[PDB]
Amino acid sequence: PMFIVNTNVPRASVPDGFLSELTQQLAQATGKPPQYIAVHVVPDQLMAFGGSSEPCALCSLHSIGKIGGAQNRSYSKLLCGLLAERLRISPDRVYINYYDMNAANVGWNNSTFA
Amino acid sequence: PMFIVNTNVPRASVPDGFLSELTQQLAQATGKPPQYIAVHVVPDQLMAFGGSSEPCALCSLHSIGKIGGAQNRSYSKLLCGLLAERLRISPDRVYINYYDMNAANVGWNNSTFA
Amino acid sequence: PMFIVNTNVPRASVPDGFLSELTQQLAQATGKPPQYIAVHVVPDQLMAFGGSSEPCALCSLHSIGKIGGAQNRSYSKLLCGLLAERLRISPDRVYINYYDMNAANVGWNNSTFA
């Protein structure tokens, strides 16, 4: 699976270890070896929630299988704690981006992902 | 990949109050509270269209409801209209992609969204 | 989501004609005019895969119709080779992200593509 974190928080206020933690947490969450875990990070973004200078956190996860609307709460419940502890941002301003497209267009190495 | 708005136009071309009217008009059209929506735009990048390295724009219109031929057409004029007056970008140089979400797939506080 | 391309390769290691040769090949490969294919690039991104901080990269695109496993593979094969022999990247973990859409969901030139 692949996870990317987008936030308005400057790199200066961004600590270290979030990469490793996310890799291990996600691996045991999705049920896949850390070898298949892709982590993308990009701080200092020009985003504003509610039309104000309110801190926002965009979390996008891309994985095939083991997905559900009801399960989404439990999945995010394990992620909100991390962001609320590290960045201290409230889950209220967190939007989880996902996909449910057929695995027919989901491949790896010389192929395309969905 | 995740949702994000990018453009080759420098940040210096962005006037003050742009984020205000942008969200105001967006909320007014969508009919949804501005407190539930967020504005994200990363300028000063590199893009081209048809060989021409002229200023271009790409934007994702993720929402829930109000989808229709006429409705979508109205949003196109609203977006390109304001963009052409604030950022001075040609309507033929901006691409808008509409994305609808499930009613049970509402965001805000541990929830998945497009 | 959004069809954004990401790479760990910094602007200090990029070649020339990146928004020219690529689009030209992409257009010829698909059989569509390069004038109808937008091209944007986002470098200097920090990303890791499988725990390895090696220079990873993810590509994406959008097309209406003429898509599928066979079609996508016919395009990805060309992309992987071109990218490898251009940005000096390993083709072992090269993948794209082609996505489809609806004609009425495409806003262009103050109007819809519908």
Ligand SMILES: CCc1cc(N2CCCC2)cc2c1N=c1c(C)cc(N3CCCC3)cc1=[SH]2
């Ligand atoms: C789900 C797409 C797929 C996605 C992958 N990623 C990495 C993080 C971004 C999404 C990674 C893999 C993958 N699919 C396969 C498939 C399909 C087969 C594989 N092998 C290893 C040798 C045996 C066959 C290995 C992978 S790795």
